[model samples]
Target: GAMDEKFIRETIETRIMMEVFCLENYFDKIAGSEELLEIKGEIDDVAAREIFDDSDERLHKLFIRASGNELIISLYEKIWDRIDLVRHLNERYVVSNREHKELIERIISGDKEGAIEKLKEHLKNVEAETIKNLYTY
Candidate 1:
């Protein structure tokens, strides 16, 4: 359990760094292209077949993939297994969805700093919530 807690915490930290780093460095690639809109469609597609968790994974991956950094992408792939382990611990599904919406908005509207702030907050919220779940279980 301790290992799970540590894994969740560290993985989220890594996520914060990698995700934010991608947005920070690849703002043009992400915000300038249709991928952001495509991601928004995925978020807004209420009747889509993809499950909540699957959509969540893709939403995050799209951001990283926009970076076009094979090294970071490969590293992200490795961490995703650990990320999956703690995904169930995240209980605020609707809340995170709203944050995801705002996150994309911030980027599309050209507010890179705000987007980064939103992302860091979102991931930290998940990390805290998941760790709390780990303790309760």
Candidate 2:
């Protein structure tokens, strides 16, 4: 069945937001320039509302059946200690955000239930944080 137009629009908007968030965080730590700030602001203006619009086609296609646990373990196995300082900094900084932090904490604390709850919370909070920071220009 064809997806509704509203769903497609929301999905594309969310993808754009995610891309903006990635770019802003990536540039903020590395460049720390005014230009990046402007770019973040532009992206943020229209990306805010779509932050929670789960209709994103990209997300549905890519992560509809995804499992956070598997992804985390896979990332740990692949890049745990192989990356350089800059790469590690970028990766860890992104992961240290709410969602990843909850996952890591859950693993450490041996509380799967707590971890899942935190993961859900992290998703909403991170999106909000990203949208809020977008206007810091």
Candidate 3:
């Protein structure tokens, strides 16, 4: 049941749609945010520890939480459980970690389009890798 392909596909798909939408829809909310800088600092600290999975979640959640819409936040929160299910399959830390830093810079610098693209590429890579890992494992 944990390895259900449909579940895996939908989880990342929903993540991509929701996360990208959040960044795009709430760009103003996130731009010029102290929270973004705070998360980037945390990412830097966690990168050395080589335990960035939680920081990864925090980075994504920050953009969503910026919306200040409880309903949206609630829905995004529910996705975390499903995201955890695929956590073991993600092995692109080198690439993903760099992307995480670049993403924050883009958002903070007011690069709306670039930020959205970064988010999309990041999750799409996760989706591709998750599915690939599932089959190989």
State each model's CA lDDT, in order: 0.81, 0.35, 0.81
Judging by TM-score against the true structure, name the best candidate. 3
Candidate 2 clashes: the total is 1
Q: Evaluate model 2: give its lDDT.
A: 0.35
**Candidate 2: tens digits of C-alpha lDDT, residues 1-137:** 34333433343345334433432233223233343334333333443324212212222222212222455335433432322221222222333332433343353455645544554454445445444444453
**Greater-TM-score candidate between 2 and 3:** 3
Cα deviation of 123 in candidate 1 (Å)?
Answer: 0.3
Error of 3 at 97 (Å): 0.8
Model 1: how far is 6 from its true place, Å? Answer: 1.7
| lDDT (10s digit) by residue, model 1, range 26-81 | 88788877766877877777633253566678778877898888999999999888
Weakest 10 consecutive residues, lDDT, candidate 3?
A: 46-55
Residue 46 error for model 1, in Å?
3.9
Candidates 1 and 3 compared: the better one by TM-score is: 3
Report per-prediction Cα RMSD to one decimal.
2.3, 16.5, 1.9
